[PDB]
Write an enzyme that holds these catalytic residues in place. Structure first.
Site, short mmCIF file in Angstrom:
data_model
loop_
_atom_site.label_atom_id
_atom_site.label_comp_id
_atom_site.label_asym_id
_atom_site.label_seq_id
_atom_site.Cartn_x
_atom_site.Cartn_y
_atom_site.Cartn_z
N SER A 95 -3.52 10.19 5.29
CA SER A 95 -2.77 9.22 4.51
C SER A 95 -2.10 8.24 5.46
O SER A 95 -1.16 8.61 6.18
CB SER A 95 -1.71 9.94 3.69
N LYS A 170 -3.99 6.31 -2.69
CA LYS A 170 -3.08 7.36 -2.22
C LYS A 170 -1.60 6.94 -2.28
O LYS A 170 -0.75 7.78 -2.54
CB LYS A 170 -3.47 7.83 -0.81
N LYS A 238 7.19 8.87 5.07
CA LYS A 238 6.21 7.93 5.64
C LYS A 238 5.33 7.32 4.54
O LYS A 238 5.10 6.10 4.54
CB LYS A 238 5.39 8.62 6.73
CL LIG Z 1 0.93 5.24 8.48
#
Ligand SMILES: [Cl-]
Length: 294
Positions: A95, A170, A238
């Protein structure tokens, strides 16, 4: 087909083992020699660098935490790009920021190396049992060629667009997962504070319109005080940072994600960054002064 597999973490390790069970020959690497040893014990080979994996494998999967890690493995010293001959394919299942997928793809294309961005969803349980959903960007011909390989780890493999579209998909996925966890936490903490046992709430609602994969995966963990990753809050931070960056680049509208991001900042500051993302419940517990327990 020898298949390269680099990144044998919480998701990567069980995924690689499903490929071995499906009859693929793997050459694997990870920063942890014990993770390599476990996967070689299941039938894999190994090599000392990403470059050497690329010299031996026509297709390589990466499963790494973020763009800097993928860039180092794919493009760096002793990286994939130094060993890959023209026609080699990278399937990055990490991801990472969609812009980073596109950047890495362009760098690899200059050397004749193809790339799919094929991130996944389903959590550690579904990585283990092979029922992950995979969401993929890149060239349709390359998608079609490696569909079976990807499907060996998955319940579903879907092509969503050009390179980067896997990671855009995602980002949408990770918005939903974060918010579904937060919503569960908000609701269970409300009911508990109002004097109703949350296990009875869970049993009562799980079959109706409030039912979800998050609810069934995470409510038991919260109530049992099991916050072991799973998927660390620091990684979800993140992903939300990437979602917010993308939203701010295209002018979408991300109020709930922006709010849950600040909750995750509070959790990180209070020592929960390495806990499973079910620990979003602990944010609510601390503010409402009640715990969600059996
Ligand atoms: Cl990243």
């Amino acid at each position: 087909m020898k298949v390269g597999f680099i990144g044998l973490g919480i998701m990567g390790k069980p995924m690689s083992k499903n490929l071995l069970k499906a009859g693929y020959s793997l050459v694997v690497s990870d920063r942890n020699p014990e993770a390599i040893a476990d996967v070689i014990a299941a039938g894999a080979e190994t090599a000392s660098t990403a470059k050497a994996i690329a010299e031996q494998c026509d297709v390589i999967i990466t499963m790494l935490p973020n763009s800097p890690h993928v860039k180092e493995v794919a493009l760096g010293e002793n990286g994939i790009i130094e060993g890959a001959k023209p026609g080699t394919v990278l399937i990055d299942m990490s991801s990472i920021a969609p812009l980073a997928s596109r950047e890495i793809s362009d760098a690899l294309k200059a050397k004749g190396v193809e790339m799919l961005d094929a991130p996944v969803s389903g959590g550690e349980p579904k990585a283990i049992d092979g029922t992950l959903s995979v969401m993929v960007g890149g060239d349709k011909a390359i998608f079609d060629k490696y569909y079976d390989l990807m499907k060996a780890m998955a319940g579903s493999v879907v092509h969503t667009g050009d390179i980067g579209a896997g990671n855009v998909t995602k980002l949408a996925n990770q918005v939903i997962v974060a918010l579904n966890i937060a919503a569960m936490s908000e609701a269970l903490t409300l009911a508990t504070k109002a004097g109703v046992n949350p296990d009875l709430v869970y049993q009562a609602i799980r079959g109706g319109l409030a039912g979800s994969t998050v609810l069934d995966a995470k409510a038991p963990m919260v109530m049992d005080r099991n916050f072991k990753p799973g998927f660390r809050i620091d990684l979800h931070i993140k992903d939300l940072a990437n979602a917010l960056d993308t939203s701010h680049g295209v002018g979408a509208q991300l109020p709930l994600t922006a709010a849950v991001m600040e909750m995750m900042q509070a959790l990180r500051a209070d020592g929960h960054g390495n806990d499973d993302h079910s620990a979003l419940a602990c944010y609510y517990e601390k503010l409402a002064k009640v715990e969600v327990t059996r």
